[PDB]
Design a binder for this molecule. Sequence first.
Ligand SMILES: *[C@H](O)[C@H](C[C@@H]1CCNC1=O)NC(=O)[C@H](CC(C)C)NC(=O)OCc1ccccc1
Ligand SMILES: *[C@H](O)[C@H](C[C@@H]1CCNC1=O)NC(=O)[C@H](CC(C)C)NC(=O)OCc1ccccc1
Lengths: 306, 306
Amino acid sequence: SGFRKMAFPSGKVEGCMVQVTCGTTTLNGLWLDDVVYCPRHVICTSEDMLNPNYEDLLIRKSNHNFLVQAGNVQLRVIGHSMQNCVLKLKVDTANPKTPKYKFVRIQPGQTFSVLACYNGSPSGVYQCAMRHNFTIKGSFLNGSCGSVGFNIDYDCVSFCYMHHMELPTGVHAGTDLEGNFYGPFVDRQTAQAAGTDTTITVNVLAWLYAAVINGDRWFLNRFTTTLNDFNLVAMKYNYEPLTQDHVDILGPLSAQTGIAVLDMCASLKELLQNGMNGRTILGSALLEDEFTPFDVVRQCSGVTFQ
Amino acid sequence: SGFRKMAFPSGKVEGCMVQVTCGTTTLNGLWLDDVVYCPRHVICTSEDMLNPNYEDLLIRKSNHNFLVQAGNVQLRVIGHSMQNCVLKLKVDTANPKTPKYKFVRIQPGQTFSVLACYNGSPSGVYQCAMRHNFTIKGSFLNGSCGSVGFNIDYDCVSFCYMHHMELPTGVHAGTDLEGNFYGPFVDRQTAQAAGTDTTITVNVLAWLYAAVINGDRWFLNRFTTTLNDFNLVAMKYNYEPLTQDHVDILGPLSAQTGIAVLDMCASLKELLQNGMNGRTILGSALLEDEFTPFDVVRQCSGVTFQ
Ligand SMILES: *[C@H](O)[C@H](C[C@@H]1CCNC1=O)NC(=O)[C@H](CC(C)C)NC(=O)OCc1ccccc1
Ligand SMILES: *[C@H](O)[C@H](C[C@@H]1CCNC1=O)NC(=O)[C@H](CC(C)C)NC(=O)OCc1ccccc1
């Protein structure tokens, strides 16, 4: 028993991280087969960051201007192209450590592990969620761009995120591996607004099920509710409206615990309206929303990877 | 910016995990050079767990009774011995993936990454602290024993923990890699008492410095205090007494932030006496104590590993 914010094992991704330097700017790239993916802002100078014309900037760049380093070994760049906000640097050597992989664009509420890197070397690994305002709450310093977010299913790495920037609120924004930003964000140094940060209701519910499984049950109350009645309380607390799909997704945890989804909704309503009265649930003094139903089953049933 | 419970990258340790089976019991072993380390309870049956005589049980065991599997490949066991609560299974093949490593016995308040494994395969990675009562707050199911806790300094893996058991309180106990338990715990299925769980004061202070660095400053107040005056308030809230060594350890964060350690103590005193009034510090609604001063500098300055 016990419940922790658990990241995927990072080894398969560690073997894909390289360093990409263009002039004075150094960041991280992802080396899959004979291609290195990195943020296109690698080509920017301190001047260029306010309002870069990425097309004009890139024209002044040839293959030999991209220094690509795997450990202490230099890769030879034989091609380069821009896809949305990422560069694809074609190298003459296939990564011998390429795992089975997919590029996936994930949905708000879904979670992933981040391998934070500097100069193509791993610093650390942590779990994040794509929030409803298409931000993540990460830990990123200068040089961290090109750090990736991923899931593992068995032996397959699903890359969903590449790090590009930090907003005024101290939260983080980036792209899928096709270089399309999550949310309305653009890769230029201008004040950009994350909108309302709504709580991922289905994920809070998942986590209350995790708590019940681990013997933390104080908050189970005597009431039930309806989707429409629960959602009136959700709107007030900036919670995502609960839908029958969410109820269906919680079906296995509901069936495992014998606690009906709408009875757990009723418990959640009283926690939102009454607070926690100085108590904790799974060692937490607020309602956690960065565990999916899948994450809870995965953690509470010991699912493993290659 | 931003601050997360960050684990070390796990790849170097992933390549050391094997599966160890003795009769019907399967758990994880650590394969370093030509030696596999695992919990000695691998030799127990369901009967044996209440009051095992480990010496008598082991006598009925030969090399060929220990099935050691690295992925889908069988290792040949050419020797076996008990060291305290671990078995060392000598194999005829040196692990080709052995990293540079040390066995360290860590001190309460120190933190480490756990690679939770089942059947010798990684499930996930998370950060833990050795608590003052020599327990950890992990996530462990049946089959997780032999999972290890570690730190990385550059290219060297320092193994500090091997998982053996869960107490009534839902917290976790285990050994160093010499097989000596942290705390008074023994490897038998009997109600065992973790004592008072004191908060790691120096670690709370470290985390308040992390908060100030990341722009969360609401809790900085107008007061200072003395070690003796602070510690009177610590004892009441079951906080570890603060010492000049702790003050010295916080010296770099104090010097970086220009907030004197005893002024931060005064801020901590008011948080303990007044609570947080429904506010958060670095997204947390309680005082976090599983970040060391080193962890804070490491995270806030981007220290990387091989
Ligand atoms: C990529 O290495 C870098 C990551 C930033 C640096 C601080 N925290 C992060 O997440 N990205 C940028 O510097 C980005 C570049 C533009 C061309 C998009 N600009 C940015 O994020 O501006 C905010 C900022 C910069 C430096 C320190 C703190 C915030
Ligand atoms: C090692 O695989 C296993 C880990 C336990 C299982 C549940 N959570 C854990 O951390 N250790 C044991 O089963 C241990 C064996 C003795 C010979 C020391 N006994 C134990 O931890 O008893 C408590 C327990 C067992 C099963 C489920 C929940 C609690």
